[PDB]
Ligand binder design. Structure first.
Ligand SMILES: Cc1nc2ccc(CCc3nc(-c4ccccc4)cn3C)nn2c1C
Ligand SMILES: [Mg+2]
Ligand SMILES: [Zn+2]
Length: 313
């Protein structure tokens, strides 16, 4: 109860910043998460013993893939921590509880393959879940782990408060399906622009949390350039393995997934920043002004990929 988590001084200061990198010491990542829950939510949000047992079971259910791994989970939770801490008064008690957990769980048991590859392979998960296939699975794995003995971190919530937090987590995880992001951001853009956006309207809040989930999920493009650049190598190592598997099924993959077309990576990142990332952080900054450093960092990284193309690196 009187037992804080404290971080060394450099991590204590830099963890508050949006561009923080959680580091290569895997054994410190649980401590970093608990630290963030404690300042974001409170030392009373969760029973320490249950929360530590939940974190360790979540870790165990992330696989040893190049990108969609335990480090990605904790990275996405840290971006959500930074958003919540820079927007103190905008979020409910239940939302603070649910959103860091949703972020830690959002890619549980990822195999390093897209929804499209599962559907072409005819994976059983593609018959169980016809849209947002991996995302319905991540939510299903989250509920499985919450139901293990001694793992119910929400045990103190009422029946209806429990149902609300699980519903925040479900919508937050479904929203990480990038297919859904384009339409969500268009609606939010129109709502903001015609001044109909209303944070007392639950369906509006839902959309705003959706966009926060996309922003946290893509936060690799908001880091210092050497982090951004080295993370892109992991991102492509997955896509290229999926491309290899597409070629094994007798299907030319898209160029993004074809290792034979490595050379167009710089131009592929430009389209990504222009079509996905910059629009995401722009609309997020319009709705939540203190998230502007994510947009500024994204713009700085777009300019670095421009320099790669001009052969200045
Ligand atoms: C956080 C984050 N999330 C993502 C998701 C996808 C991508 C790849 C983006 C892309 N590359 C290509 C491409 C590459 C080589 C040859 C031809 C085309 C196409 N496109 C859209 N980057 N990414 C990042 C950085
Ligand atoms: Mg995902
Ligand atoms: Zn993710």
């Amino acid at each position: 109860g009187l037992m804080q988590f404290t971080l060394p001084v450099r991590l204590c200061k830099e963890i508050e910043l949006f561009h923080f990198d959680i580091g290569p010491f895997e054994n410190m990542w649980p401590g970093i998460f608990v630290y963030m829950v404690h300042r974001s939510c409170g030392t009373s949000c969760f029973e320490l013993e249950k929360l530590c047992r939940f974190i360790m079971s979540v870790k165990k259910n992330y696989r040893r893939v190049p990108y969609h791994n335990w480090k990605h989970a904790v990275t996405v939770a840290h971006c959500m921590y930074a958003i919540l801490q820079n927007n103190h008064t905008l979020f409910t008690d239940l939302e603070r509880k649910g959103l860091l957990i949703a972020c830690l769980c959002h890619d549980l048991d990822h195999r390093g393959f897209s929804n499209s590859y599962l559907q072409k392979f005819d994976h059983p998960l593609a018959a169980l879940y016809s849209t947002s296939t991996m995302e319905q699975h991540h939510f299903s794995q989250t509920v499985s782990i919450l139901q293990l003995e001694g793992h119910n971190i929400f045990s103190t919530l009422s029946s209806s408060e429990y149902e609300q937090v699980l519903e925040i987590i479900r919508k937050a995880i479904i929203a990480t399906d990038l297919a859904l992001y384009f339409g969500n951001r268009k609606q939010l853009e129109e709502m903001y622009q015609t001044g109909s956006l209303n944070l007392n309207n639950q369906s509006h809040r839902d959309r705003v949390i959706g966009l926060m989930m996309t922003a946290c999920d893509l936060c690799s493009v908001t880091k210092l350039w050497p982090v951004t650049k080295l993370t892109a190598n992991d991102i492509y190592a997955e896509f290229w393995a999926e491309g290899d598997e597409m070629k094994k099924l007798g299907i030319q993959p898209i160029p993004m997934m074809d290792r034979d077309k490595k050379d167009e990576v710089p131009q592929g990142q430009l389209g990504f920043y222009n079509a996905v990332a910059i629009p995401c952080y722009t609309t997020l900054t319009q709705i939540l002004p203190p998230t502007e450093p994510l947009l500024k960092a994204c713009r700085d990284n777009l300019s670095q990929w421009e320099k790669v193309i001009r052969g200045e690196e």
